[model samples]
Target: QTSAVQQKLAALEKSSGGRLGVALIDTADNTQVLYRGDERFPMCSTSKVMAAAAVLKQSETQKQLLNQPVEIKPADLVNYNPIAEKHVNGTMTLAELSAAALQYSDNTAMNKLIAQLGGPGGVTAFARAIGDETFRLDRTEPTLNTAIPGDPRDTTTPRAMAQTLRQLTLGHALGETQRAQLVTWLKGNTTGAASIRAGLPTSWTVGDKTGSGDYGTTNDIAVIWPQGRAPLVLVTYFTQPQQNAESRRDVLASAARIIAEGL
Candidate 1:
């Protein structure tokens, strides 16, 4: 049986007259508020979240220090990114790169992290091992030039993406310390303030990653922590024939606000 929250979110999606995929879960009860949750969309920058997870998991086992610095070459730099655009040459720690990737959605920072974990293939292997088979980490950011043509760039179903967040929330992949650190980075993220975070009540705490892709695809996978209540995970995938970045951001904010009120 569909709950009222699901109905409300579904109605919101339909009213938008655009493609939408969503999965909202109440972690305390494992209850679902799903709307086209099974369909996959391009993960885009949201893929970075999982990539970071995989890398952090490996780092834990390998005794690697995220503080260790790596050199940034000119080739590593991608066009139009804050981090790489500022410096043609310099070194940034893995932790700093991860921060730039998560906080600013920096493409060069993400590619550097991917290279650190071996390569695209290595990230894919880790995703598969963690049972996130649908997420294909075949591409990097900034250019998205690495993606397989005519295919979704690093896609995942809304449900699967939410489940992956649940894993981190429940400490399945990383230990408490590492998991906490990851959430810290996500919470500290500065790029997605206009999306889901915009709709949320000022008091509620949200940690999330946002994605922007070609052909009107915009996504936000977020962990919502309501004051005095259990944490909820909400993942949204929105696509329209013509992209409107502002409207896409508003869609998440409005739906998130409605969901927050209902919950």
Candidate 2:
């Protein structure tokens, strides 16, 4: 079944005019379809999901961390911070910051969470603790989105991302309540309408985080609940060498469609 899908993906990649990486897994059966799954790709905003999980994991012990108020000042704002811009000079809880980052890809909110986590290194430590050695966050937002081809900083492979996401969302990396909260934030994401979500059947529930960056990088990592099945984890990373070229949403969407059909 997956062999046919792999061949189709090859044809799809040949025509995309860009590099593509994918990792799809059925959690119940451990079925997989991988395309360049071991290669590195810029994480972009998809790193927000991991940041959120790390925050939640910390809160599991701190208890008050999530409710602690964070002052949002003008200096904290960065590019593409729609949600945080409104809260500047005001305050938002750590939990709210995590939600904004995951749900809206708010740059300022993400940076705030990064600061709370003790910078990008902190998030990297969290990934290591979870047994995901291939995942790393070397920089914060805006800079992390550079998406330079062959650059190793702030990048992760499709397989590593899928595995990490599965651990955080479906495994024991986070407490039960924290896990549910993380899933809720992802389910409310507004940035992936035309990406993975567009490719899945309407009956399936999708929780995803999207990332866009330089060099035509666009990505989506998702946990999908098919109508009667357990769940599936899907990660798609797409990029091209054209500097500043628009990321192709259709390519990611079509890839999701092909994967679903193959399953």
Candidate 3:
């Protein structure tokens, strides 16, 4: 498996556009940093995952039921240009919001959920509560739809990103029951599947999320379980793309492929 990590790194370096940074930690043991260039860069939608985390943490402490339903009225509509941006009106449960937020990477729903829990302050508090004060979720948007250069929305280190997932996975960030629920949501995520999903066998439960900026930012946080092997975590970030869409997917795909080959 060690050999696979090196091989995957080799394959990725051959194609990465500008800078790449990776922070990998196996909760089962210690960690070894993986880097190509610069790894700490602004995280895009991936931060939304933490938004869910903050909500779940609140739900746990406050005894909020995941199955409890909340109404979605016509007034909830915020975006006008893309009708798809509007949330479906009806009674939606917290669990349903979690699903929509992750599977579709719904931004509006995320802010609504965060606000329901507390606010950007609450989300930021949740991260700090878990010993990560550096990770910020502050903003005034209802759904976290936009990314401003100087806003609380900003970059994250590989380790911080992985730690967010790690806290959820290791069942340390939230209550036992809530931690279990977080993992379930992560496994069901469908947005930005370029790297993590492309790398694993269909049967393995690869709980993953993708984040990026406009031009060259590509990020993936993956939990890989090779066939008949233990689960492992890999979080990567790439900045300033040269030509990423088609060729970049393979660069990511091959990294996971190489890692899996080692296992």
Candidate 4:
């Protein structure tokens, strides 16, 4: 099934630096990791999935109204949420803040969301709720304290991510309203240019987030469209970080195209 994907991606190795690993899976049948490398390559912004979901679970449990407003301070804007640079300090409803966390993978937006969700530990509980046993709950605030080459990934694995997507697919991840809200927000996610999202037709509904750090470490995980043939969950990580953006994204786009065509 992945023959064409392999061939097409191979042609782009010179550009990709061959420091990339990609995994494509059908949530219905489990995973087939194509280019998995390290055990845990920093989940990056993608870890927000756990953080955000945990907040929702807490809100539901306490019957806490999610409609509350979450203010964004200049201080909280320390590392993430580049959008905040556009304005003075501001405030948004929990819903809007969560949207920022999911769609833009906004760092401060995520920080605020997770802090409200019940701190980092609550986020870990959310991961467990979804059955992601390997998710190494990141401490620190919105950003990571370590770099790729220096610390490698201290988050989770591609297979674990695939399973996480599977939980959402099986309707076992979040509550009905929260589930719809989260999935919809994910569809609005502005990152991740490779694999499933890059490969399929523009019309197929999909949502994803990307993680790129020091040394060109890039991880993109997403669900494919067409929603019928074979639901694909793809994660691609690059070991080196010095490649040109255009070249790397091109490889990602090509890989996506190949996966879509191959399947």
Compare the candidates by TM-score and give the number of the best one: 2
User: Where does candidate 4 stray beyond 4 Å?
Assistant: 1-15, 28-33, 84-90, 150-153, 192-196, 227-230, 241-247
lDDT of each: 0.77, 0.91, 0.63, 0.63
Name the candidate, 1 or 3, with the larger lDDT value: 1
lDDT of each residue in 133-217, candidate 4, tens digit only: 7776656454462434545334677777766765664356777777776677677787754534665687677777676555555
Cand. 4 Cα-lDDT? 0.63
Estimated TM-score per prediction?
0.90, 0.98, 0.78, 0.80
List clashing residue pairs in candidate 1. none
Q: Write the per-residue lDDT of candidate 2 for residues 1-263, one digit (tens) a residue.
A: 44888888878889998989999989879988898899999999999988989999999999899998899999888898898888888899999999999998999999998999999999999999999999889998889999999999999999999999998888899999999999889889888889998998999999999999999998999999998888999999998988778989888998999999988
For model 1 the TM-score comes to: 0.90
Candidate 3: tens digits of C-alpha lDDT, residues 1-263? 44446645755766664455566665445555455423355566677778777778767756756677777766665542122244356567777777677766665566567767677777777777888756766563433423333344655677776766777776487889887777787778766467767877777768887765544556778766555655677777665543233225555565666555554
- Candidate 1 lDDT score at position 160: 84
The 10-residue segment of model 4 with minimum total lDDT is 241-250
Q: Is candidate 2 or candidate 4 better by TM-score?
A: 2
